[PDB]
């Protein structure tokens, strides 16, 4: 999560309840102390309403027992699944477009075959008239 | 002077077909010549008169294909 | 009812108001965002014009209970993963068949088109030689 003012990972994260957005505590508090407004919605906001997020000590202890393998694994099962879903969606669209194209191409091929045979007939007739 | 004009082959978006190994007719020779030109990327040059005879041939072909 | 793109039972059914056809939400939204058109009629369609079909509570319970009751016999993660792989293979076989057929037809079409133009040319040349 990134602070919406700084675009950096906050060192003391807070949630504005108005914008439902994470900010750096100092930045948000100072902005409110100057303007009295939420920096995204421009709604009135008070320092008491700001919900400071606590970085849980449990979060640290949970990133301990997640094996170094699983933190070095630049994969998450959610992200893997979503990638597989996006692939499936894309391949479904591709197969649809393939079918539609193949049908159009069959109809076109039939048309061109009729045109070829008509050209051959005109040519043969002109040749016959030239030899007589 | 016979002005030569390049016949635009409408098939630029399609893969060049193979040569006919036994060209039994003038049509098949013309086909092989078109294929050779496409392979070489050369335009198929025809006399300027031939383009008007092509338009008339297309008019006859239409009457045939309407059956 | 099946999605007109995937041929499967949708999970978030939507109706195009142009084609009056049912699709999976994700597929139709992607196709519209790419092409700006309805995939069947090719009429111009926006994502806001899509009508999301609300499933009745009997439909929601049926989708959950069909999934549940039939996955229940093979609900182990290892069986799920094996089924996923087999389904991917099935899709990839279908895509390969489609692509192969399109390639073969395209080569044939190209051949026939060259034959048609060769015949037209020979006809025009015979007509010239007969009118001289």
From Swiss-Prot, chains A, C:
Location of this chain's protein in the cell: Nucleus
Chain positions covered by the region annotation Interaction with CEF1: 76-132
Superkingdom, natural source: Eukaryota
Domain U-box: 1-71
Residue span of region Required for self-association: 57-132
Further remarks about this protein from its record: Present with 11700 molecules/cell in log phase SD medium.
Role summary: Probable ubiquitin-protein ligase involved in pre-mRNA splicing. Acts as a central component of the NTC complex (or PRP19-associated complex) that associates to the spliceosome to mediate conformational rearrangement or to stabilize the structure of the spliceosome after U4 snRNA dissociation, which leads to spliceosome maturation. It is also probably involved in DNA repair.
Family: Belongs to the WD repeat PRP19 family.
Subunit and partners: Homotetramer. Component of the NTC complex (or PRP19-associated complex), composed of at least CEF1, CLF1, ISY1, NTC20, SNT309, SYF1, SYF2, and PRP19.
Protein's recorded name: Pre-mRNA-processing factor 19
Protein's organism: Saccharomyces cerevisiae (strain ATCC 204508 / S288c)
Full-sequence range covered: 1 to 132 of 503
UniProtKB/Swiss-Prot annotation, chain B:
Further comment found in the protein's record: Present with 784 molecules/cell in log phase SD medium.
Organism: Saccharomyces cerevisiae (strain ATCC 204508 / S288c) (Baker's yeast)
Spans annotated as Interaction with PRP19 and self-interaction: 36-66
Subunit structure: Belongs to the NTC complex (or PRP19-associated complex), composed of at least CEF1, CLF1, ISY1, NTC20, SNT309, SYF1, SYF2, and PRP19.
Highest taxon of source: Eukaryota
Record's function text: Involved in pre-mRNA splicing and cell cycle control. Required for the binding of the NTC complex (or PRP19-associated complex) components to the spliceosome to mediate conformational rearrangement or to stabilize the structure of the spliceosome after U4 snRNA dissociation, which leads to spliceosome maturation. Its absence leads to an arrest of the cell cycle, possibly due to the inefficient splicing of TUB1.
Name of the molecule in the record: Pre-mRNA-splicing factor CEF1
Subcellular location as annotated: Cytoplasm; Nucleus
Organismal lineage: Eukaryota, Fungi, Dikarya, Ascomycota, Saccharomycotina
Similarity-based family: Belongs to the CEF1 family.
């Amino acid at each position: 999560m990134l602070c919406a003012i700084s675009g950096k990972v906050p060192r003391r994260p807070v949630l504005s309840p108005k914008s439902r957005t994470i900010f750096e505590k100092s930045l948000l508090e100072q902005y409110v102390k100057d303007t009295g407004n939420d920096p995204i919605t421009n709604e009135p906001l008070s320092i008491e309403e700001i919900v400071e997020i606590v970085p849980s000590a449990q979060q640290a202890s949970l990133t301990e027992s997640t094996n170094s393998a699983t933190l070095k694994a630049n994969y998450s099962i959610p992200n893997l699944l979503t990638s597989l879903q996006n692939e499936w969606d894309a391949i479904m669209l591709e197969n649809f477009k393939l079918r539609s194209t193949l049908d159009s191409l069959t109809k076109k091929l039939s048309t061109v075959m009729y045109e070829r045979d008509a050209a051959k007939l005109v040519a043969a007739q002109l040749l016959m008239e030239k030899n007589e | 002077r016979v002005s030569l004009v390049a016949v635009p082959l409408a098939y630029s978006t399609l893969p060049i077909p193979e040569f006919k190994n036994n060209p039994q007719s003038a049509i098949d020779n013309k086909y092989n010549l078109l294929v050779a030109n496409a392979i070489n990327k050369e335009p198929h040059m025809v006399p300027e008169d031939t383009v008007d005879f092509l338009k008339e041939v297309e008019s006859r072909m239409q009457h045939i294909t309407q059956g």
